[PDB]
RNA sequence: CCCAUGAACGAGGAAUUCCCAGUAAGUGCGGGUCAUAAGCUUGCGUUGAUUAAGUCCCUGCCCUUUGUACACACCGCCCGU
RNA sequence: CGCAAGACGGACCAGAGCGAAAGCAUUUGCCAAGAAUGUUUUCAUUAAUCAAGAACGAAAGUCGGAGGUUCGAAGACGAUCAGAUACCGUCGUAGUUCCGACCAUAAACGAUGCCGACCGGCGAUGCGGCGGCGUUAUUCCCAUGACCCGCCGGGCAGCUUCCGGGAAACCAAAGUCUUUGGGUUCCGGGGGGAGUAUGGUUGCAAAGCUGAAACUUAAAGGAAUUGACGGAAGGGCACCACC
């Protein structure tokens, strides 16, 4: 039986898809087929934060951000929790999770 | 020891905080990054390759260096940042956070915090095979 | 054995004219034992400058890269090697439903300085646009990269180094690309991502003095 | 039994066979 | 760093590994008008005063 | 936990819907009543019954509740409900009429009305939430 | 019952039990067993606290979604030499 | 701070585009192609599907050259384990890269032949064309670009629906089927033996295509429902749990 009517991708109207690799396992996964993360984080964490900036030399220098693209295999994305099972009904909902 | 510079004003190095996942270096160099003033690791604190990369083998090394160019001369810091880059993690490992905590807690002024990791266009083939690593 | 840090002497590094603040910082280098030469040791290196501490009021996110090229009395005079963009403002611009477009010109000052600049742009989205996504076609993204080739080979290859410089400081030639590029398509964050040096004449002490002030 | 471990021994026996009958 | 006193303006919710702490919000005695958030280890309630020897960390959220 | 049970909750909204005259707001009163109108074979429960009541009487006295239905408090609802403002809301000197709609009044044959007030249409055509 | 004799034991390792108020714990007393008999058990008073007003971390046990080739139901089913 | 050698074209990158399918992503130039749209051009049935016969055809593999960065079957070790000829780690051959000849196989999948007609809605999206206030490049001119509101046509799809189907999952086709016939190609007939033996044919080889029988067996199998279980994810409870 068919579980997902995308086949858990997103190929439509093409044949191959470059593959890519997993942050975590180094798996050769398909692109379309990957899930992405897109890490926007401080470079210095809150609990640091006064110290860098009482322990600075300018004035509001705002400190740099961090950006990173994770792309996860399937697997690696259930254990780290990145994505759950949900129901068969929950399972057309596509809309983010709100956050 | 060191130069002749008055109170008001601070001399500046630049700091390199490699933080991997198996050890995390601090290496303090000039502004032209071609003269060392103090490179101390993780390794060279904590006897236990489990803790190499611990926060506290980082915050033993932070204030080590940061001890060793308050006493070269040089109070104030240019931090850069690096992960293992390549077609590895991007990520920086544990000890960078703790590293940077302990040189600010240990009197040095902070300069500029750049984030400066190899990031190819298109690298080689990472080393996990095309199942990847499965432990 | 002995620390080195006590055979080695201390020298100031001085930034070239075009730049408000001179003194940039302090370089420690070895002292002359026969051969070696603190002179030498001290000139092929590299200084990495944010554009807010060499000038008083500007933005942060761009970097010059200078370089020394000769020492005279606990001074070193550099000259004008590169310029970048941070990589956080790199990576804060490459948004997911815009068209990224990339040019790049090897041209040459009057000077004889041989250059490579590196320019980017992204696609804007009108104030009161519904559509989600706002991409370029592939036409009108070969007509953007045509118009800041040349803009930049215009821009450069009638100047020298210096007047490059004092237009690389504020971005005019960016503006100029937004300016021109507004038909075609309107772009947001047009830049010159990277210069770097590709050739440069022989050594003139001259020119440097005129350069560092 | 896989099915190509399978395939994969029913070819180590055809060749053998083939090698056999020279 | 000296001592200061920080009195509680509303317990916050419950925290630890077996639930062992109280995450507050105080403000300070002095100030009057800066406000953190803290773990307090024992039966807290409104009103009391907890002395901080160090005085500038922030109780993660939640 | 001080839950009441069903047997409670229902055995208090019965005895409100059928006593409303009788009851009130005094719990000792209520209890008197209860037990005389009802057949409740523990003190206790004659207690929990009537403490509901209370409760329930309390409730009622600021609206309604939707367990309960008096067929005398409904008049009285109605009656509260009957509000009726001095000058109807739908009569107006003058009325706002988009161009359109006096288009479409006029194809009515009600092109001579008076009141109607040409209003200016709208500019941009941006009624449309973006997407993304 | 008497008189003698006078051992280990100086607070107990890994590991574990039971407990939220007249409670734990000290302390006696009754009932049963009982010709003779309580270091047991079942009840009773008497003296009378520390700490907590919380959480799923450990241990279970419930759900809920999910997978199954199980349905004697994972102590299942099942593959090859 | 430089130099070199090979590989690869991140982020932009989408349930977006192109190609018959495998497949296709740095800039620029050249070369020949191509669908859709536009059309009061032209021919005038020239068409649809296809035994035979042809072109292309992932990866791996085979012969030659060139090159060999990274990764890496095999192999040599180090760990883990009762054992490990594995999972993890170190090194590392063939290979991975380019050119020229073979190979023609994939879960080569939409597990759904191609052509044509009819049968519900809705919002988007890519290309082309047709309209329309009003904002932007500009500062003034028409432009033509970027938005905005519609329409038409061909596409990749999506949501919805008591269209109707179906064992059901589900499908706007998998509907218009006992109210059974639009055209046409391939192909299946309980489970094993078996895609095996044999013969033929192709190939340097590995192998490809075609392809049985004896014998054995009452089931094998598909969807869906309850339980039970899980080394899956979430909650909740208890001093025979914890704090
Ligand atoms: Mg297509
Ligand atoms: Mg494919
Ligand atoms: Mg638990
Ligand atoms: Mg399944
Ligand atoms: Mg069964
Ligand atoms: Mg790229
Ligand atoms: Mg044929
Ligand atoms: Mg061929
Ligand atoms: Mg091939
Ligand atoms: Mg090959
Ligand atoms: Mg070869
Ligand atoms: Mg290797
Ligand atoms: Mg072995
Ligand atoms: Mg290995
Ligand atoms: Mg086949
Ligand atoms: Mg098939
Ligand atoms: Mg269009
Ligand atoms: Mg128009
Ligand atoms: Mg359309
Ligand atoms: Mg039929
Ligand atoms: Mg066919
Ligand atoms: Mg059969
Ligand atoms: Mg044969
Ligand atoms: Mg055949
Ligand atoms: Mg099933
Ligand atoms: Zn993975």
New binding site residues.
């Given amino acids: 039986?068919?579980?997902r009517?995308?086949?858990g991708?997103?190929?439509?109207?093409?044949?191959?898809?470059?593959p890519?690799r997993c942050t975590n396992?180094a798996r050769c996964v398909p692109?379309?087929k990957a899930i992405?993360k897109?890490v926007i984080r401080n470079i210095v964490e809150a609990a640091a934060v006064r110290d860098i900036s009482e322990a600075s030399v300018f004035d509001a220098y705002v400190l740099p951000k961090l950006?990173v693209?994770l792309h996860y295999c399937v697997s690696c994305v259930?254990?780290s929790?990145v994505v759950?099972?949900?129901?068969?009904?929950?399972?057309?909902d596509?809309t983010p999770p709100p956050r | 020891l060191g130069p002749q510079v008055a109170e008001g004003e601070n001399v500046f190095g630049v700091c390199h905080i490699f933080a991997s996942f198996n050890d995390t270096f601090v290496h303090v160099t000039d502004l032209?990054?071609?003269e060392t003033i103090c490179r101390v690791t993780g390794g060279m604190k904590v006897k236990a390759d489990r803790d190499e990369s611990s926060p506290y083998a980082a915050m033993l090394a932070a204030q080590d260096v940061a001890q060793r160019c308050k006493e070269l001369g040089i109070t104030a810091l240019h931090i850069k940042l690096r992960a293992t880059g390549g077609?590895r993690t991007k990520t920086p490992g544990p000890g960078a956070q703790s590293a940077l905590r302990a040189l600010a807690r240990s009197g040095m002024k902070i300069g500029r915090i750049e984030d400066v990791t190899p990031?190819?266009?298109?690298?080689?083939?990472?080393?996990?095979?095309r199942?990847?690593?499965?432990? | 054995v002995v620390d080195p840090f006590s055979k080695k002497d201390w020298y100031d590094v001085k930034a070239p004219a075009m730049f408000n603040i001179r003194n940039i910082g302090k370089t420690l280098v070895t002292r002359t034992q026969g051969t070696k030469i603190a002179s030498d040791g001290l000139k092929?290196?590299?200084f990495?400058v944010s554009l807010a501490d060499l000038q008083n009021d500007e933005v942060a996110f761009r970097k010059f890269?200078l370089?020394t090229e000769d020492v005279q009395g606990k001074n070193c005079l550099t000259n004008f090697?590169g310029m970048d963009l941070t990589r956080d403002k790199?990576?804060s611009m490459?948004?997911?439903?815009?068209?990224?477009i990339?040019?790049?010109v090897d041209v040459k000052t009057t000077d004889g300085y041989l250059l490579r600049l590196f320019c980017?742009g992204?696609?804007?989205?009108?104030?009161?646009?519904?559509?989600?996504?706002?991409?370029?076609?592939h036409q009108?993204?070969?007509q953007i990269?045509?118009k800041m080739?040349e803009i930049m080979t215009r821009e450069v290859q009638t100047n020298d180094l210096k007047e490059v410089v004092n237009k690389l400081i504020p971005d005019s030639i960016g503006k100029d690309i937004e300016?021109?590029?507004?038909?075609?398509?309107?772009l947001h964050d047009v830049f010159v991502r990277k210069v770097k040096?590709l050739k440069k004449p022989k050594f003139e002490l001259g020119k440097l003095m005129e350069l560092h002030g | 039994?896989?099915?190509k471990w399978?395939?994969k021994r029913?070819?180590?026996?055809?060749?053998k066979?083939?090698?056999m009958?020279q | 760093q000296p001592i200061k006193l920080a009195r509680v303006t509303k317990v916050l919710?419950?925290?630890?590994?077996?639930?062992?702490c109280?995450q507050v919000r105080v403000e300070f005695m002095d100030d009057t008008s800066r406000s953190i958030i803290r773990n307090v280890k024992?039966?807290?309630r409104e009103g009391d005063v907890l002395t901080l020897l160090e005085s500038e960390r922030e109780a993660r959220r939640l | 936990g001080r839950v009441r049970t069903k047997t409670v909750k229902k055995a208090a909204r019965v005895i409100i819907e059928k006593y409303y005259t009788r009851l009130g707001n005094d719990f000792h009163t209520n209890k008197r009543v209860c037990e005389e109108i009802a057949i409740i074979p523990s003190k206790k429960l004659r207690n929990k019954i009537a403490g509901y009541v209370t409760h329930l009487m309390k409730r009622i006295q600021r609206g309604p509740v939707r367990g309960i239905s008096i067929k005398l408090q409904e008049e009285e609802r109605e009656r509260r409900d009957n509000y009726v403002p001095e000058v109807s809301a739908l009569d107006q000197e003058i009325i706002e009429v988009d161009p359109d709609t006096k288009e479409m009044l006029k194809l009515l044959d009600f092109g001579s009305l008076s009141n109607l007030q040409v209003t200016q249409?709208?500019?941009?055509?941006?009624?449309?939430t973006?997407?993304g």
């Avoid at chain 4, 029913?10 to 060749?15: A, D, Q, T």
């Fill in positions: 039986t068919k579980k009517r995308n086949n991708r997103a190929k439509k109207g093409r044949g191959h898809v470059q890519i396992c692109k379309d992405k897109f950006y693209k259930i254990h929790k759950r099972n949900r129901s068969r009904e929950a399972r057309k596509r | 032209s990054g071609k077609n990031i190819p266009s298109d690298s080689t083939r990472r080393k996990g095979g199942r990847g690593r499965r432990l | 092929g290196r590299v990495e890269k370089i090697h790199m990576c490459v948004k997911k439903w815009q068209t990224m990339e040019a790049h980017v992204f696609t804007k989205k009108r104030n009161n646009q519904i559509r989600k996504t706002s991409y370029a076609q009108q993204v070969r990269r045509k080739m300016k021109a590029c507004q038909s075609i398509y309107p040096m | 039994m896989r099915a399978r395939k029913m070819r180590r026996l055809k060749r066979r083939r090698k009958r | 919710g419950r925290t630890g590994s077996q639930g062992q109280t024992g039966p807290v | 249409p709208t500019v941009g055509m941006n009624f449309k973006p997407r």
